[PDB]
Design a protein around this ligand. Sequence first.
Ligand SMILES: Nc1c(F)ccc2cnc(-n3ccc4ccncc43)cc12
Ligand SMILES: Nc1c(F)ccc2cnc(-n3ccc4ccncc43)cc12
Ligand SMILES: Nc1c(F)ccc2cnc(-n3ccc4ccncc43)cc12
Ligand SMILES: Nc1c(F)ccc2cnc(-n3ccc4ccncc43)cc12
Ligand SMILES: Nc1c(F)ccc2cnc(-n3ccc4ccncc43)cc12
Ligand SMILES: Nc1c(F)ccc2cnc(-n3ccc4ccncc43)cc12
Lengths: 75, 75, 75, 75, 75, 75
Amino acid sequence: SVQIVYKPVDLSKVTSKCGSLGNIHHKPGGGQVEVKSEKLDFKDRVQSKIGSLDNITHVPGGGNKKIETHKLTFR
Amino acid sequence: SVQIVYKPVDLSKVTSKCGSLGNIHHKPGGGQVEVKSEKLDFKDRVQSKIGSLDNITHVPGGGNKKIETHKLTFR
Amino acid sequence: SVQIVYKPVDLSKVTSKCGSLGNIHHKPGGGQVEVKSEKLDFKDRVQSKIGSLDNITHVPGGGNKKIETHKLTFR
Amino acid sequence: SVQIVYKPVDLSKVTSKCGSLGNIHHKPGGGQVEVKSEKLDFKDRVQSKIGSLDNITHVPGGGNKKIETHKLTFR
Amino acid sequence: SVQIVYKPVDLSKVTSKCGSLGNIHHKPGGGQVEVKSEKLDFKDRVQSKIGSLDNITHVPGGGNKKIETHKLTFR
Amino acid sequence: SVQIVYKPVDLSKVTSKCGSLGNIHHKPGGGQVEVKSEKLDFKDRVQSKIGSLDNITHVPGGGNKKIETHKLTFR
Ligand SMILES: Nc1c(F)ccc2cnc(-n3ccc4ccncc43)cc12
Ligand SMILES: Nc1c(F)ccc2cnc(-n3ccc4ccncc43)cc12
Ligand SMILES: Nc1c(F)ccc2cnc(-n3ccc4ccncc43)cc12
Ligand SMILES: Nc1c(F)ccc2cnc(-n3ccc4ccncc43)cc12
Ligand SMILES: Nc1c(F)ccc2cnc(-n3ccc4ccncc43)cc12
Ligand SMILES: Nc1c(F)ccc2cnc(-n3ccc4ccncc43)cc12
């Protein structure tokens, strides 16, 4: 006989407080990018960037993350 | 005989407070990008960027994330 | 005999408060992009960008995310 | 009695030969300029440029110059 | 009694030959410029540039110069 | 008695020959400039540049110069 009981209990807090958030300046001075390739072959589950001059300002008021995997395998 | 009981309990909080959010300046000075290729072959589940000059200002008032995966496999 | 009971309980909060959100300036100074290719072959589930000069201002008042996957497989 | 005999002689050549002139690429990636002032006071014979993002391609087939000043002053 | 005789003789050559002129690439990656002032006072014979991001391609087939002054002063 | 005889003689050559001129690449990677001032006072015969991010490609097929001052003063 097999009995499997899977009862995780989660009471977690992920939390932040900020009084104020601001006066943020992102002022990048350009630039130059060159890429040479011949053949690209991309297959299962690829994340790729080639030849980029990207500027990102990311200012979340919270920006909190919780990541949670439950896996049960029986054979 | 097999009994499998799967009862995860989740009371999670992902939370934030901000009193004010602002005064954000994103002012990029241009730039230059060149890419050369001959052949691109992309198959299953490819995320790709080639030859980009992208500017992003992302300012969510919260921007909080919960990611929660439940997998039960019986063979 | 097999009994499988799958009863996840979820009371999750994903939440945010912002008193004010604003005074955001996105002012990009142009730029230049060149891409050369000969052949593009894209098959299942491809997300692709080629030769881009994109400006994005994304300011959600919340922008909170919950992603929740339940998979039960019986073979 | 005073005699002034001002007789300059000039058989100068300013000259060029070019067999072919070309394949010229001027390809600038943008940029960003900011100038702050409160007061400008410009008087006689002022040449001024303030806050400029200027692109010039100048390709004369000759572009040769002769500058020649003659000045006789008597008091 | 005074005699002034002023007879410069000029047979000068300023000269060039080029068989071909070309394949010139001017390709600048942007940039960022900021200038702060309060008061500018410019008087006689001022040549001025303030806050500039200038790109120049100058390709004269000759571009030869002769500059020449002939001053006679009698008091 | 005064006799002043001014007879300069000039037979000179300034000269160049080039078989071919080319394959020139000027490719600058941007950059950043900040200047702070309060008062500028400019008077007779001033040549000035303040806060610049300038790119110059200068390719004369000749580019030869002759500068020539003749001056005579009498009292
Ligand atoms: N999620 C993505 C794709 F689907 C494809 C290409 C990517 C390239 N880059 C990032 N990336 C994230 C954070 C970071 C920081 C610095 N550089 C790069 C970064 C994420 C990608
Ligand atoms: N979600 C996406 C696609 F479907 C295809 C291409 C992508 C390229 N890039 C990102 N990416 C995310 C964050 C980050 C940060 C820096 N660079 C790159 C980034 C995401 C992509
Ligand atoms: N969802 C998409 C498509 F269906 C196809 C192409 C894409 C390229 N890019 C992004 N992307 C997202 C975030 C980010 C950040 C930076 N660069 C790139 C990004 C998303 C894409
Ligand atoms: N002739 C002019 C005016 F009447 C007033 C302003 C000027 C500003 N600049 C130039 N100038 C010439 C060549 C060069 C090269 C680089 N930067 C600047 C230049 C000339 C002007
Ligand atoms: N002729 C002019 C004006 F009437 C007023 C401003 C000027 C600023 N600059 C130049 N200039 C010439 C050659 C060079 C090279 C580099 N930087 C600057 C230059 C010339 C000017
Ligand atoms: N002719 C000019 C003006 F009337 C006013 C400003 C100037 C600033 N700069 C130059 N200049 C020439 C050659 C060089 C090389 C490097 N830097 C600077 C240069 C020339 C000017």
